[PDB]
């Protein structure tokens, strides 16, 4: 799948985008890859932050659905006009499909000033499509209309700019080492999974596992951070604050409220612990674990334009909507979204940034009992 390798570009913290064309003749746009939403939505008006926008007047294959969509969220919103048009991915399979497109005509704190992307490609399921599950997501359209197998895979490579690979319709063996390990997709809405055990430095947090998945755990390329439920994040940092005693830091640091800095290069990775998430396996009583480094959860902030050292945001933080395995997780791994078999695969990435003493890993099998129980109803 060589034509697809390295088809993702981005800047640190601003997400990963892929080049897409919409309409006839084709209009090129950069489109954020988002496994945490299900709408294909593109800027359609000259917002000042946008390099470019979808011009429906130029497209002979444009069809109006004559229906609006309104998408509110915490700090903002986007809204627009539903329609369909012809859509392709130049560095993706060699096919063109008719997909639903939300033409965004108003938004608040949605677009990033300084970023080079102009829309979002929600790769998750119809269940969370807006305004409702009858709006067929792009990837469902793609599979329905071509012979492209029902799966895609992501290698997010992380670095000011980032690259990676979205392989649509298959798996590229050169993007990973060792074996793939699969965790079941518990339900087709978000890419929901079940974490069954957590260890910081080989030490079990010994929380009821149900806590880990309260009330969801999801895989999300649209989120930078590893995000954790309040009750689990308290426990996580308690053990993280404790594994890292040689040095102390502001309390706000841990709340993602202040930054932390050391003399350039002088960052002590090693006083920071590895974190291991055991996921539900394919077999009864069987699990596997993925292990990430501090080099994954301490992410270097380029933008302190009032600083001269090495400052990082603690990239773990809390939620009311459950665990989110964002780019901090995904960047250590090759992630396989095997929709045809309702499972997600993880292997060690051939690109993840490794150091002398400690390495990201995917290991199994382990014996874990009562893994169902870990899920929330
Ligand atoms: C505000 N945002 C987020 O909080 C991202 C985290 C959750 N999330 C994801 N993955 N896709 C999203 C789409 C919307 Cl409309 C709102 C939240 C989203 C998104 C704004 C649009 C681009 C991705 C970040």
Please report the domains of the chain, with CATH numbers, ordered by start residue.
16-148 (2.40.70.10), 149-377 (2.40.70.10)
Write the CA distances from 255 to 4, 12, 24, 31, 230, integer angstroms.
38, 20, 48, 31, 11
Q: Which atom of ligand 1 is nearest to the CA of 41?
A: 15
Closest CA to 343 of 192, 133, 164: 192
DSSP labels, 180-191? EEEEE-SSBTTB
Whole-number Å distance, alpha carbon 78 to ligand 1 midpoint, is 11
User: In this structure, are residues 8 and 16 in contact, taking their beta carbons and an 8 Å threshold?
Assistant: yes
Whole-number Å distance, alpha carbon 76 to ligand 1 midpoint, is 10
3-state secondary structure of 275: strand
Contacts of the segment 229-237: beta carbons below 8 A, 24+ positions apart: 229/318, 229/319, 229/322, 229/323, 230/318, 230/319, 230/320, 231/207, 232/198, 232/205, 232/207, 232/323, 233/316, 233/317, 233/318, 235/205, 235/207, 236/198, 236/200, 236/205, 236/275, 236/316, 237/316
User: In this structure, are residues 243 and 236 in contact, taking their beta carbons and an 8 Å threshold?
Assistant: no
Q: What experiment produced this structure?
A: X-ray
Q: Is 34 considered catalytic here?
A: yes
Alpha carbons within 13 angstroms on the beta-carbon side of residue 235 total 19
3-state secondary structure of 22: strand
Q: Is 108 considered catalytic here?
A: no
Whole-number Å distance, alpha carbon 281 to ligand 1 midpoint, is 28
Q: Is the CB of 10 under 6 A from ligand 1?
A: no
Separation between Cα atoms, residue 290 and residue 296, nearest integer Å? 13
User: In this structure, are residues 209 and 193 in contact, taking their beta carbons and an 8 Å threshold?
Assistant: no
Structure tokens at 100: 């639903």
Backbone angles phi, psi at 350, to 5 degrees: -70, -5
Q: Is the CB of 69 under 6 A from ligand 1?
A: no
Separation between Cα atoms, residue 316 and residue 126, nearest integer Å? 29
Alpha carbons within 13 angstroms on the beta-carbon side of residue 79 total 9
Backbone angles phi, psi at 182, to 5 degrees: -110, 140
Beta bridge partners of 121: 33, 40
Classify burial at 25, counting beta carbons within 10 Å of its beta carbon; exposed 0-12, middle 13-18, buried 19 or more: exposed
Separation between Cα atoms, residue 111 and residue 28, nearest integer Å? 17
* Ligand 1 atom 6, closest CA: 223
The conformation of residue 192, written as its DSSP 8-state character, comes to: B
3-state secondary structure of 156: strand
Write the CA distances from 185 to 172, 178, 190, 216, 344, integer angstroms.
21, 22, 9, 12, 7
């Amino acid at each position: 799948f060589v034509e697809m390798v390295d088809n993702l570009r981005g800047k640190s913290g601003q997400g990963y985008y892929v080049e897409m064309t919409v309409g006839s003749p084709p209009q090129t746009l950069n489109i954020l890859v988002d496994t945490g939403s299900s709408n294909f939505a593109v800027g359609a008006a000259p917002h000042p932050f946008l390099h470019r926008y979808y011009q429906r007047q130029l497209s002979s294959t444009y069809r109006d659905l004559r229906k609006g969509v309104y998408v509110p969220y915490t700090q903002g919103k986007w809204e627009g006009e539903l329609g369909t048009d012809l859509v392709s991915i130049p560095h993706g399979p060699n096919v063109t499909v008719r997909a639903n497109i939300a033409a965004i005509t108003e938004s608040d704190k949605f677009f990033i000033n300084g970023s080079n992307w102009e829309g979002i490609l929600g790769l998750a399921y119809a269940e969370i499509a807006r305004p409702d599950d009858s709006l067929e997501p792009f990837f469902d359209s793609l599979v329905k209309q071509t012979h492209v197998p029902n799966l895609f895979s992501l290698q997010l490579c992380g670095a000011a700019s980032v690259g990676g690979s979205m392989i649509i319709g298959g798996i590229d063996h050169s993007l990973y080492t060792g074996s793939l390990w699969y965790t079941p997709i518990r339900r087709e809405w978000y890419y929901e999974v079940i974490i069954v055990r957590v260890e910081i430095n080989g030490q079990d947090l010994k929380m009821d596992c149900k806590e880990y998945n309260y009330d969801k755990s999801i895989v999300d390329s649209g989120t930078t951070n590893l995000r954790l439920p309040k009750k689990v994040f308290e426990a996580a940092v308690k053990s993280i604050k404790a594994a890292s005693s040689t040095e102390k830091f502001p309390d706000g640091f841990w709340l993602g409220e202040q930054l932390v800095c050391w003399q350039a290069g002088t960052t002590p990775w090693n006083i920071f612990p590895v974190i291991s998430l055991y996921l539900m396996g394919e077999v009864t009583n069987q699990s596997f674990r993925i292990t990430i480094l501090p080099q994954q959860y301490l992410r270097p902030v380029e933008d302190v334009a009032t600083s001269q050292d090495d400052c990082y945001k603690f990239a773990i933080s809390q939620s009311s909507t459950g665990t989110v395995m964002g780019a901090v997780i995904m960047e250590g791994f090759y992630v396989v979204f095997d929709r045809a078999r309702k499972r997600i695969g993880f292997a060690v990435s051939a690109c993840h940034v490794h150091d002398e003493f400690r390495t990201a890993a995917v290991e199994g099998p382990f014996v874990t009992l009562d893994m169902e129980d870990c899920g929330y109803n």
